[PDB]
RNA sequence: UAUGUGAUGGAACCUCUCCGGAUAAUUCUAUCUCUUCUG
């Protein structure tokens, strides 16, 4: 197979969602911020 | 650490309301100090 590397260089900041359980991955807190 | 024919989340102002305020002449006279030995 062939591998094509990619790089993403952020500039200022970005948003991160927190960890959720497998059974609770369809809540409002997960759908928003997906 | 995703799973793939489908992600406007850049898709949302911690915004709004509240006298560091009130009262006071930089003025002025009565003592202080305890053990003395027969008196």
Q: So what's the overall shape? A: flat
Count of DSSP E strands? 0
Largest sheet properties: none
**Strand content of the residues, in percent?**
under 5%
Structural class: little secondary structure
Give the C-alpha Rg. 15 Å
- Helix share bin: 10-25%
- How many DSSP helices? 1
H/E series: H
End-to-end separation = 31 Å
PDB class: antiviral protein
Keywords: CRISPR-cas, effector, regulator, CrRNA, guide RNA, antiphage, antiviral protein
Entry title: Cryo-EM structure of a CRISPR effector in complex with a caspase regulator
Name: cas7-11
Question: Can you tag this structure with a few keywords?
Answer:
1 chains, 34 residues, flat, 1 helix, antiviral protein, little secondary structure
Describe it.
This protein has 34 residues and is mostly loops. The chain is 12% helix and 0% strand. It is built from one helix and no strands. It has one helix at residues 28-31. It starts with 27 loop residues before the first helix and ends with a helix. The protein binds one RNA strand of 39 nucleotides through loops. The PDB classes it as antiviral protein.
Brief description of this entry?
The PDB classes it as antiviral protein. The chain is low in regular secondary structure.
Question: Which helices and strands appear, and what pairs or packs with what?
Answer:
Layout: H1 28-31
The chain binds one RNA strand of 39 nucleotides through residues 15, 32-34.
PDB class: antiviral protein
Keywords: CRISPR-cas, effector, regulator, CrRNA, guide RNA, antiphage, antiviral protein
Entry title: Cryo-EM structure of a CRISPR effector in complex with a caspase regulator
